[PDB]
Design a binder for this molecule. Structure first.
Ligand SMILES: *[C@@H]1O[C@H](CO)[C@@H](O[C@@H]2O[C@H](CO)[C@@H](O)[C@H](O)[C@H]2NC(C)=O)[C@H](O)[C@H]1NC(C)=O
Ligand SMILES: *[C@@H]1O[C@H](CO)[C@@H](O)[C@H](O)[C@H]1NC(C)=O
Lengths: 49, 49, 49
């Protein structure tokens, strides 16, 4: 349980290593949407945070 | 138009990169997993163009 | 005689039609030393047939 739309709970842009491969390819997907970068391409864009 | 030129259709996904000077006409609901999601919608089962 | 002019039962919007003079045909043919010998090779590169 996190906060509402006025004070949306943000994990800061700071220094943890993740994995875009298995995290983006879960089974229960009902609504996924991306504007600037296509939803089919998420792995090959990464920085320090 | 002020109502929007909603006539030209773009693509955003394919199974593999196509060789040049090639065109396709077919539009099929995508399957991107072990489950044969033919259907009308589902996990990465979207309209092509 | 050649019946069934439309060997396809149905045709959608056709992208291109071409009609020209036929190849070097030979009417009938003598048994032994047949005049007709078709030697065709079909190649494609990058759309060129
Ligand atoms: C021409 O059509 C064939 C289908 O017969 C395409 O081949 C498919 O390519 C995808 C790409 O990942 C494969 O997943 C399919 O398994 C292939 N089909 C078969 C039957 O093997 C081919 O890609 C098409 N040509 C172009 C340039 O797209
Ligand atoms: C053959 O050519 C004639 C052109 O005079 C055309 O009208 C006809 O439809 C053609 N038939 C086939 C089977 O292609």
């Amino acid at each position: 349980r996190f906060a509402s739309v006025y004070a949306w709970n943000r994990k800061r842009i700071s220094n943890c290593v993740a994995d875009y491969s298995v995290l983006y390819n879960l089974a229960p997907f009902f609504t996924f949407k991306c504007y600037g970068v296509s939803p089919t391409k998420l792995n090959d864009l990464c920085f320090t945070n | 138009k002020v109502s929007g030129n909603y006539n030209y259709l773009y693509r955003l996904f394919r199974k593999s990169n196509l060789k040049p000077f090639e065109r396709d006409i077919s539009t099929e609901i995508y399957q991107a997993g072990n489950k044969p999601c033919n259907g009308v919608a589902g996990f990465n089962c979207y309209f092509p163009l | 005689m050649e019946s069934e002019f439309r060997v396809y039962s149905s045709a959608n919007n056709c992208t291109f039609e071409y009609v020209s003079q036929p190849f070097l045909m030979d009417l009938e043919g003598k048994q032994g030393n047949f005049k007709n010998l078709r030697e065709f090779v079909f190649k494609n590169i990058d759309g060129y047939f």
